[PDB]
Amino acid sequence: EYVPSEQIFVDEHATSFADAQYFCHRVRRSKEDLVAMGFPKDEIEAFQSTVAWSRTDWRQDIDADIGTDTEDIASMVWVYEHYIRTGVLDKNKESKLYQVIQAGEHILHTEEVTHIPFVTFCPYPIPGSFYGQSVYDIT
Amino acid sequence: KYSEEVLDELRVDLQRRFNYAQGYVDMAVKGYAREAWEYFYGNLPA
Amino acid sequence: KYSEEVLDELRVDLQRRFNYAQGYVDMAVKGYAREAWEYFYGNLPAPVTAGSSSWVDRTVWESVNGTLQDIINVFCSGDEAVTFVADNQQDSDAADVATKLVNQILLRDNPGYNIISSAAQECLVTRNSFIKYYWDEQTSYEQTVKRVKVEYVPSEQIFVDEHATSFADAQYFCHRVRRSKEDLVAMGFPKDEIEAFQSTVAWSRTDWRQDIDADIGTDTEDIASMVWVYEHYIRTGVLDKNKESKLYQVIQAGEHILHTEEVTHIPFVTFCPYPIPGSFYGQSVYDIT
Amino acid sequence: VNPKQLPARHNLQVVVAISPNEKAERAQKLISLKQLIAADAQ
Amino acid sequence: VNPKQLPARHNLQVVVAISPNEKAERAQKLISLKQLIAADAQ
Amino acid sequence: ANWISVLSPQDTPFVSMTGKESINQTIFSWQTDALASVDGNNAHVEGSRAEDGEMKPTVIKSNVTQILRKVVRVSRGRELMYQLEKKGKEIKRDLEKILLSGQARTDVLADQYLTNSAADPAVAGLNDTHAARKTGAFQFLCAHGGLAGGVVDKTKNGPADPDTGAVTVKVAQNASNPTTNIGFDEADIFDMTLQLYTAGSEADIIMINPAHAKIFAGLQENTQGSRKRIFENTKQFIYEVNSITDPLGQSYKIIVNRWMPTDAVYFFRSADWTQMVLRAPKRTELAKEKWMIEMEVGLRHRNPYASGVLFTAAGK
Amino acid sequence: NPTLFVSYDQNGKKLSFANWISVLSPQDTPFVSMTGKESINQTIFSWQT
Amino acid sequence: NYGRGRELMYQLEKKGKEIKRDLEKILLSGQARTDVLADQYLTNSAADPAVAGLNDTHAARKTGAFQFLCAHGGLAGGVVDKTKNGPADPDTGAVTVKVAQNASNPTTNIGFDEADIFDMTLQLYTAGSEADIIMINPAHAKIFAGLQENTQGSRKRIFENTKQFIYEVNSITDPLGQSYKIIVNRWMPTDAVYFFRSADWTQMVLRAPKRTELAKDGSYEKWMIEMEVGLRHRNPYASGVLFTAAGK
Amino acid sequence: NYGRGRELMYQLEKKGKEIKRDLEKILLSGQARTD
Amino acid sequence: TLFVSYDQNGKKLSFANWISVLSSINQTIFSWQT
Amino acid sequence: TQMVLRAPKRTELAKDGSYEKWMIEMEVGLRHRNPYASGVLFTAAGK
């Protein structure tokens, strides 16, 4: 699936996915997948990225209600996915990379992974940086 | 055998990292992307 | 049987050499590279007055792209990068093997396309650009690998002497790097892991988004916390001067040396468009336009 | 693959800037050579 | 299809930007090769 | 000429010797007071009949973090990056100067930091009740024995830890001169080593202002005639000291730092001190063309009776 | 509250405690711990000076 | 909790460390002996006199330290007098415990005079102990260091273009050829030094450190640590001690 | 942050819902176009 | 001595945000005909 | 929702001269959310 840039958050000291130390990607996932991993007794865990999106056009408003009931399990909710290279364990251990998937004040999943499944397009790239140029800045 | 204190420390570290990353990325990319999208349709020049 | 006094003398000599090399290289290259990068985006000519409406003319960027497109159409146009060729049949069986190996290592293992694009776009404005290759020996189920870590290297993280004109006759050559605490613990101070700390200005001015001296979220105690280390290649008789002028690679941290060894070749390579004879640095599009 | 078994740069010429279609080109050359070696029986 | 049975990227070159007619092109090449292999009996 | 000259005094040994650790709140806290005393005799008569134990659990200590702005105002070529790097170096120097000062954290909250019930109720609606966050300094956390309002008192020794009698903060007494020269005695740092060994600090570093290194330099010599250098056909005049070993067998490495107060000397240790940071240095601008920096930082110390401080003056 | 973010009135904070306790205490026992034992049964032993 | 793990294992390790520290202090201290058993029919007639028959208090129970005279001069009641020179061993004639004066030095610099060590060594030599170890507390090692400093010029240090400075001394060689090593202990009376011997002088434990507990009354988490260690010396006239100069 | 962190988006969502409720109420309420 | 190790309670936890929830024309003027 | 601390469990404490004691020690607590969310209606004849 495609992924906009308004729902991405990365560190400054990084220049590519390889040396990237921290990489976040907010997602909108239903309550079903969350119940599949945490808080089965509680399903009422409610809640710029919206401005840039609602301004890419002038029709949509991501922070509105399309009609989904809040209690309905399929109600979409914002979750925070992160890839971090850090020794959360004893720092003497290798700088292991870890994928974490959490909700509001609750963590749902954690695991190891040695590769970020994300890919980025960089037309007119800028060496020594994670972001290239854009037609806007040129025209 | 993951401790809850470990998870709390991880939450704190990740929260501060996300705060810094947002504070950077906003003015780095989105401040320009918004006006670029506005120029896309010619809505910025008032 | 390396004495600590020898290491202290080496530290002093290397510190003074780095000081001189920085004092030279700054005004030699970076003072021009910063303004060249600023002209790249047309940010140097300031709005002297509101009524002037000083519309900038992005011309350097144009020529940079016009050259970079042809450059990539020359080298990176082919599905392969290079192909070794021999002169006899007794050594032809190795040509294809070496070719396949280097192609795999460069493309199927490393992002050679991005490396070349970066080494090119950054060279025509910085007067030079560098590429480097090392032996990666990562280890964790305790799998250990031996890879060819090839990577681009900006000119803002390089420091060289003035009396040199090429890697061959280069007497001193430094390259600051940002390596995690893991690799350092693998070679020194296992009981202590809290060894915290223009090159940043030129980089944060190549663009206006990044700030290398900030915190992306990494905890200082986290072993993966990146730290600045000083790598150096020096030709000197640190031993009795009567001995040959041996070359030595040193890798140190703040007031601490981690590794030392001998080596007869610098793994760094430099691009020099419009080269300048008798010098280590060529010309640049900025100075021409 | 033994490293000592490999030759040195003194006997290894290098070439760069290879077009994509060169493969096909080689093929053509090859088949040409084929015809040649078909005409000579020695 | 066993995943362990597959090779690694070190021995897998990739190509992109393939024209639609390339298939036909290949066919031509093939038939050309056919003629070639028809001329040599060895 | 296409370059500029800048002195750029940037020693900063302390910042690189203490590391750093991220937090998630403007106020952090730890808890450690001591182990139980010895009590001497512990004989018994075959019976416990205790009094719910004398645990007396640990005390909870905290510290506050402050803010540094160092605004940039533009009205060499691109002077922006130059002034930005200059201000960055200046703020780093200011941090190195502050963290080693004698400041004492002062804020509306003293020990009830939480006060979630009140928490300054008269804050919302007007938003102009802004107080000034002041963090704890080095001399404040090293088992001080007072403070002149907002600065540690430089004429009062610290208290004693109940675990073992040790006074890690003492008023220097140069018994060599008749209170005329402002200098360390020959046996005033060894007293600190003794106290630390009794308290068990394991420190091995000593920062010093160059206005005091002459003392340790001359310490290698004397007038009574029991200590004197020698030169056996040597073309050198080394006049320096960088290592000490008290009779207790505790090594101590000396380092010089120009950003310390002249009327004080410090006994540091790598792990016992940590630099807590909340907001990293960010280049940005205010609300809706200036530039600015903002760095939230705080000071943490593992245990007060571990590190040591010693004031230099004459008693009066 | 996306309008203005205020700090003094921040409710439901996280104290951010430290998962470690400095229990430094002088306890070495250099020699007395390495002498030995001569376990006995009674409590009126002697050594016949 | 947030920094604590449990309230039992933590407190148990706490009490263990405390009991070890207590033992260390009690052995090397003035813990005068106080016993009630004035046994008269000993030597292969082991019995308890009619007294102490049914009563079950048995308060007085101590051991070691001078009262456990250990070849000392005399104590004043329930406190050890650090001012009494020991008796003379009739074998050869030697006092293993004495108190040098602070007249050779100022009347406020409590400490030794660099001559009392060699006197103690000669006394031991005449006694035939062969001790070679010293257990001294801080505030007295500076004497061991500066013995070569508080002179007229005879003794002196040397620094040959060396950036290191040292006042550490962990060994001395008696003129009699007896080598002695210095070891610092912190559980001393900060007024004396012990010329003790090697492991030959060992202790003995009756009830090893072990845990017990009562079940419940209404509610509690009681526990116990009731080690029953005891000390023993060997030919008290062998080893010796040297108090510091206080005055009387 | 100490307590929660990231209060901006919380406040922004609160204000969005607030203006939604306000619009509903005022639109269903009667008031002239006095100008 | 005296190891209990029952009072660590180094939780150092933060808040959880358990709050409760209760949830084109171009010109400035528009007209219609009736 | 409830706030059971550890659990409801039965166990015996130290005995006595031919006695036998037992305890339960159940510890719980309530948790209401949004106090203005549950209705209460008293009955009164007047005020």
Coordinates of C-alpha atoms in Angstrom, one line a residue, chain C residues 149-287:
Chain C
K149 CA 30.7 -2.0 3.5
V150 CA 30.7 0.6 0.7
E151 CA 29.3 4.0 1.4
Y152 CA 29.4 7.6 0.2
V153 CA 31.2 10.1 2.4
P154 CA 30.6 13.9 2.3
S155 CA 33.5 16.4 2.2
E156 CA 32.3 18.1 5.4
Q157 CA 33.6 15.1 7.4
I158 CA 37.1 15.0 6.0
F159 CA 40.3 16.7 7.1
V160 CA 43.6 16.5 5.1
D161 CA 47.0 18.2 5.1
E162 CA 47.9 21.0 2.7
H163 CA 51.2 19.7 1.4
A164 CA 49.4 16.7 -0.2
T165 CA 48.1 16.4 -3.7
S166 CA 46.9 12.8 -3.9
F167 CA 46.1 9.8 -1.7
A168 CA 49.5 8.4 -2.6
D169 CA 51.7 11.1 -1.1
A170 CA 49.2 12.1 1.5
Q171 CA 50.9 12.2 4.9
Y172 CA 47.8 12.7 7.1
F173 CA 44.2 12.0 6.4
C174 CA 41.4 12.2 8.9
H175 CA 37.7 11.2 8.6
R176 CA 35.3 11.8 11.5
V177 CA 32.6 9.1 11.7
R178 CA 29.4 8.6 13.6
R179 CA 29.5 5.0 15.1
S180 CA 27.4 3.4 17.8
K181 CA 28.8 2.6 21.2
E182 CA 28.6 -1.1 20.3
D183 CA 31.6 -1.1 18.0
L184 CA 33.6 0.9 20.6
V185 CA 32.7 -1.5 23.4
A186 CA 34.0 -4.2 21.1
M187 CA 37.5 -2.7 21.4
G188 CA 37.8 -0.6 24.6
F189 CA 36.3 0.5 27.9
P190 CA 33.8 -2.3 28.6
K191 CA 33.1 -1.0 32.1
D192 CA 32.4 2.5 30.9
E193 CA 29.8 3.2 28.2
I194 CA 29.0 6.8 29.0
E195 CA 31.9 8.3 26.9
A196 CA 30.0 11.1 25.3
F197 CA 31.4 13.8 23.1
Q198 CA 31.8 23.9 10.5
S199 CA 31.4 20.2 9.6
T200 CA 27.8 20.6 11.0
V201 CA 27.2 24.0 9.5
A202 CA 28.1 23.1 6.0
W203 CA 25.9 20.0 6.2
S204 CA 22.9 21.8 7.8
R205 CA 23.3 24.4 5.0
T206 CA 23.5 22.0 2.1
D207 CA 19.8 21.9 2.9
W208 CA 17.7 23.8 5.5
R209 CA 15.9 20.8 7.1
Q210 CA 18.5 18.7 9.0
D211 CA 20.5 19.6 12.1
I212 CA 23.2 17.0 12.8
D213 CA 23.8 18.3 16.3
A214 CA 20.3 17.6 17.5
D215 CA 18.6 14.6 19.3
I216 CA 16.5 12.3 17.0
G217 CA 15.3 10.5 20.1
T218 CA 18.2 8.2 21.0
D219 CA 18.9 7.8 24.7
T220 CA 22.5 8.6 25.6
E221 CA 23.0 5.4 27.6
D222 CA 21.5 3.3 24.8
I223 CA 24.4 1.3 23.3
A224 CA 23.2 2.1 19.8
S225 CA 23.6 5.8 20.6
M226 CA 25.7 7.2 17.8
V227 CA 29.0 8.9 18.8
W228 CA 31.7 10.8 16.9
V229 CA 34.9 8.9 16.5
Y230 CA 38.1 10.0 14.8
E231 CA 39.7 7.8 12.2
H232 CA 43.1 8.7 10.8
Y233 CA 45.7 7.4 8.3
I234 CA 49.2 8.8 9.0
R235 CA 52.6 8.2 7.4
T236 CA 55.1 8.7 10.1
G237 CA 57.8 7.0 12.1
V238 CA 56.0 7.0 15.4
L239 CA 58.7 4.4 16.2
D240 CA 62.4 5.2 16.0
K241 CA 62.6 7.6 13.1
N242 CA 65.4 5.4 11.7
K243 CA 62.7 2.9 10.8
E244 CA 60.9 3.3 7.4
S245 CA 58.1 5.8 7.2
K246 CA 55.3 3.3 7.8
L247 CA 51.7 4.1 7.3
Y248 CA 49.3 3.4 10.1
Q249 CA 45.5 3.5 10.6
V250 CA 44.3 4.7 14.0
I251 CA 40.8 4.8 15.3
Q252 CA 40.2 6.8 18.5
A253 CA 37.5 8.3 20.6
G254 CA 37.5 11.3 23.0
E255 CA 40.9 11.1 24.8
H256 CA 41.0 7.4 24.1
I257 CA 42.5 5.2 21.3
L258 CA 40.6 2.1 20.3
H259 CA 42.5 0.5 17.4
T260 CA 45.8 0.8 15.6
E261 CA 47.1 -1.2 12.7
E262 CA 49.3 -1.1 9.6
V263 CA 47.9 -0.6 6.1
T264 CA 49.5 0.2 2.7
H265 CA 46.5 1.7 0.9
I266 CA 43.8 4.2 1.7
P267 CA 40.3 2.7 1.0
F268 CA 39.0 6.2 0.1
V269 CA 38.5 7.4 -3.4
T270 CA 37.9 10.9 -4.6
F271 CA 36.1 12.4 -7.6
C272 CA 37.9 15.4 -9.3
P273 CA 35.9 16.9 -12.2
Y274 CA 38.0 19.7 -13.9
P275 CA 41.0 18.6 -11.8
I276 CA 43.8 21.0 -10.9
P277 CA 47.3 19.6 -11.4
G278 CA 49.7 19.7 -8.4
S279 CA 46.7 19.8 -6.0
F280 CA 44.4 17.4 -4.1
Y281 CA 41.3 19.4 -5.0
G282 CA 39.9 20.1 -8.5
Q283 CA 37.5 22.8 -9.5
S284 CA 33.7 23.2 -9.1
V285 CA 30.8 24.4 -11.1
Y286 CA 30.1 27.1 -8.5
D287 CA 33.5 28.8 -9.1

